[PDB]
Write an enzyme that holds these catalytic residues in place. Structure first.
Site, mmCIF file in Angstrom:
data_model
loop_
_atom_site.group_PDB
_atom_site.id
_atom_site.type_symbol
_atom_site.label_atom_id
_atom_site.label_comp_id
_atom_site.label_asym_id
_atom_site.label_seq_id
_atom_site.Cartn_x
_atom_site.Cartn_y
_atom_site.Cartn_z
ATOM 1 N N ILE A 1 25.719 13.620 3.980
ATOM 2 C CA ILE A 1 26.359 12.794 4.288
ATOM 3 C C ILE A 1 26.602 12.006 3.267
ATOM 4 O O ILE A 1 26.820 12.109 2.025
ATOM 5 C CB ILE A 1 25.330 12.037 5.276
ATOM 6 N N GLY A 2 27.517 11.027 3.663
ATOM 7 C CA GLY A 2 27.895 9.563 2.614
ATOM 8 C C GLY A 2 26.819 8.972 2.528
ATOM 9 O O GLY A 2 26.100 8.501 3.246
ATOM 10 N N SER A 3 27.118 8.512 1.268
ATOM 11 C CA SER A 3 25.930 7.608 0.912
ATOM 12 C C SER A 3 26.294 5.939 0.961
ATOM 13 O O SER A 3 27.257 6.011 1.690
ATOM 14 C CB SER A 3 25.634 7.403 -0.901
ATOM 15 N N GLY A 4 25.656 4.844 0.566
ATOM 16 C CA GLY A 4 25.933 3.302 0.722
ATOM 17 C C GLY A 4 27.123 2.664 -0.624
ATOM 18 O O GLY A 4 28.075 2.242 0.986
ATOM 19 N N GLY B 1 29.471 7.083 -1.758
ATOM 20 C CA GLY B 1 28.270 7.215 -2.992
ATOM 21 C C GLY B 1 28.407 8.910 -2.311
ATOM 22 O O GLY B 1 28.542 9.144 -0.820
ATOM 23 N N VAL B 2 27.589 9.898 -2.779
ATOM 24 C CA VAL B 2 27.132 10.994 -2.402
ATOM 25 C C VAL B 2 25.659 11.982 -2.048
ATOM 26 O O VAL B 2 24.776 11.399 -3.056
ATOM 27 C CB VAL B 2 28.284 12.155 -3.237
ATOM 28 N N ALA B 3 25.592 12.777 -0.950
ATOM 29 C CA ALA B 3 23.344 12.838 -1.062
ATOM 30 C C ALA B 3 23.816 14.206 -0.322
ATOM 31 O O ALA B 3 24.582 14.029 0.554
ATOM 32 C CB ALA B 3 23.585 11.487 -0.675
ATOM 33 N N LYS C 1 20.143 12.452 -3.808
ATOM 34 C CA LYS C 1 21.113 11.942 -4.568
ATOM 35 C C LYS C 1 20.309 13.175 -5.950
ATOM 36 O O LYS C 1 19.522 13.073 -6.859
ATOM 37 C CB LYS C 1 20.868 10.812 -5.333
ATOM 38 N N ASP D 1 24.201 -6.371 -7.720
ATOM 39 C CA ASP D 1 23.163 -5.660 -7.639
ATOM 40 C C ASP D 1 22.357 -4.315 -6.197
ATOM 41 O O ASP D 1 21.471 -3.874 -6.382
ATOM 42 C CB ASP D 1 21.618 -6.207 -8.955
#
Ligand SMILES: [Mg+2]
Ligand SMILES: [Mg+2]
EC number: 2.7.11.1
Lengths: 290, 315
Positions: A8-11, A14-16, A29, A119
């Site tokens: 899947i695609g991260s937040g 990103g990648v995971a 991750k 952050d």
């Protein structure tokens, strides 16, 4: 041990790799083992590990492999909130209130743990099936993140940008975060981001943000207390904008507010939901070896 | 010796949609496209013009119209400017000449896009090409026997592999880059930090084609570099950020060189007659490989790559 399921695609762009344990899903991750394992990566993990709020996506553990250092995170099985609202419609005033209480509880905790603004990246809201809970603040989210990121040429959801971010050079980050929460509330209620609409016309969206020109359409019927909270949040002047503690005492917020979300201190959250630091430290050590 | 014999264009190209909903990347390769007055490469061994092969990558944003327009026009615009600068055949080094010709070319296209300069339509009308918030990057390379000329605008980049050390021929126009940041701020504009350094919180670049709405802070002035070719040169790689987001200069060049050599070692170099009349399969191999490598490294953007072999022969 865990079993591969997907990629899947991260937040924050990103990648995971989605994997499975218990019958629990986890988001993993990865990070190139070739001494990319600085002091930045150590502090960032131990930091995120100390975040224990149930509405924060929390660190599970760190596994060493021949390829890289694996960062096992808690998974949000409901996915992105916006993509939810799209293929389900706007939520009701009561469903919106449920989640908003959770957000504020979470933002409030993060603020207390010194995590905020860039952050915390509140543009990213996830959902999870295991209350329902909304979940914010994933691992690769800090400003100084060692986690790889691939953002777009044009900004995605500009509605989240508080006017003072564009207008001033000094401002409180926690207060900019209030605006973001407003945005998240609006989308839940209306099913569309506020100041935007033809979409991706940044000129029109930015114009509307700066003049706080929003409009709750007629097909959406929400109480006057709710509309008031929104009007109190969407104010360009940071100084006149309603604060988190103020939100916590507002009528709309207080209605049907569960007992556990009436928590003052940050240290009762930690005990409320309760891998050792020596284990994490031993593995990051063996990780510096390519 | 290099100024009395044209080179054969050896190249391969990939341009794919990747994980995105649209394809807003575009490219253009026009070999044998223009004739370059020798004085623009040499100085003050006769061959009055060198054949110049045009390569272009255009990474669009906000839409596809401007990237596509660059694809269809820019090289022709560049040709026109080369012709215009034969009113220098009267009256200032090479760098300045190229910088000058490339700036007018990029600027002309920009103007055509906003409907302030007249363009052709199926008699020479003033019509915008796209909305004010759509734009594109542009990185172009002119290769001839003697020189490479790269003209960059945005975050696509061109990288030369010379011997064993990768050397980029463009520097990404990111808003947090020293001079760029300064230019914007000193001009009265704002760079915010939000999902990366952005002009006014929106655009992750300080230069581009189009993007009327962010003028005159986001400028179409390119940064031209004038590079004499060398015997150590291995290859030249142009690509959009779809590639550079997941791979560094050095590894891209090395991988590209390997695959080129790999195909030549396991297929041998083809006959001179075929060469330059289309894509060099060894380059296409490298291009294709880098392309899939990017996809596996997690790149989710449009991907466009042009690999150009610079080596006379490989034995
Ligand atoms: Mg693109
Ligand atoms: Mg791109």
């Amino acid at each position: 041990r865990y079993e591969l399921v997907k990629d899947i695609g991260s937040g924050n762009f990103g990648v995971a790799r989605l994997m499975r344990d218990s019958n629990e899903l986890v988001a993993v991750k990865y990070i190139e083992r070739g001494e990319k394992i600085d002091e930045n990566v150590k502090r960032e993990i131990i930091n995120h590990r100390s975040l224990r709020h149930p509405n924060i996506v929390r660190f599970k553990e760190v596994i060493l492999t021949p390829t890289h250092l694996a960062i096992v995170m808690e998974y949000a099985s409901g996915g992105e909130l916006f993509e939810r609202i799209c293929n389900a419609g706007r939520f009701s005033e009561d469903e919106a209130r449920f989640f908003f209480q959770q957000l504020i509880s979470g933002v409030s905790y993060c603020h207390a743990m010194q995590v905020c603004h860039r952050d915390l990246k509140l543009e990213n809201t996830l959902l999870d099936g295991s209350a329902p809970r909304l979940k914010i603040c994933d691992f690769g989210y800090s400003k100084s993140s060692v986690l790889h990121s691939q953002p777009k040429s044009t900004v995605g959801t500009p509605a989240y940008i508080a006017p003072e971010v564009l207008l001033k050079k000094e401002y409180d980050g926690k207060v900019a975060d209030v605006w973001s929460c407003g945005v998240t509330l609006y989308v839940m209620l209306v099913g569309a981001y506020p100041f935007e609409d033809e979409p991706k016309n940044f000129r029109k969206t930015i114009h509307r943000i700066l003049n706080v020109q929003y409009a709750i359409p007629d097909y959406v019927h929400i109480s006057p207390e709710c509309r008031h909270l929104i009007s109190r949040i969407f104010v360009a002047d940071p100084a006149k904008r309603i604060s988190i503690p103020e939100i916590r005492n507002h009528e709309w917020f207080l209605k049907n507010l569960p007992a556990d979300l009436m928590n003052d201190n940050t240290m009762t959250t930690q005990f409320a939901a309760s891998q050792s630091i020596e284990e994490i430290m031993q593995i990051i050590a063996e990780a510096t070896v390519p | 010796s290099v100024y009395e014999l044209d080179c054969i264009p050896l190249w391969g190209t990939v341009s794919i949609q990747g994980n995105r909903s649209e394809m807003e990347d575009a490219f253009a390769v026009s070999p044998h496209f223009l004739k370059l007055p020798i004085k623009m490469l040499m100085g003050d061994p006769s061959l009055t013009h060198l054949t110049g092969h045009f390569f272009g990558v255009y990474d669009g944003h906000g839409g596809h119209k401007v990237a596509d327009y660059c694809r269809d026009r820019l090289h022709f615009a560049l040709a026109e400017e080369i012709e215009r600068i034969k009113d220098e055949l009267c009256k200032e080094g090479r760098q300045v000449q190229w910088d000058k010709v490339f700036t007018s070319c990029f600027l002309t296209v920009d103007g055509e896009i906003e409907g302030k300069i007249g363009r052709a339509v199926v008699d020479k009308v003033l019509e915008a090409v796209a909305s004010e918030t759509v734009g594109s990057t542009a990185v172009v390379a002119l290769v001839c026997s003697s020189h490479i000329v790269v003209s960059n605008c945005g975050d696509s980049r061109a990288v030369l592999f010379r011997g064993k050390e990768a050397m980029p021929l463009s520097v990404d126009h990111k808003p947090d880059r020293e001079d760029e940041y300064a230019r914007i701020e000193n001009a009265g504009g704002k760079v915010i930090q939000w999902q990366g350094a952005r002009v006014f919180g929106v655009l992750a670049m300080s230069r581009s084609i189009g993007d009327r709405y962010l003028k005159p802070y986001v400028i179409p002035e390119p940064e031209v570099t004038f590079m004499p070719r060398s015997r150590e040169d291995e290859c030249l790689i142009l690509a959009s950020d779809g590639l550079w987001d997941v791979m560094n200069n050095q590894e891209v060049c090395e991988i590209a060189r390997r695959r080129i050599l790999m195909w030549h070692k396991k297929n041998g170099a083809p006959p001179l007659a075929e060469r330059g009349k289309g894509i060099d399969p060894a380059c296409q191999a490298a291009a294709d490989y880098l392309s899939m490598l990017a996809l596996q490294k997690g790149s989710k953007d449009n991907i466009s790559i042009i690999v150009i072999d610079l080596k006379a022969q490989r034995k």
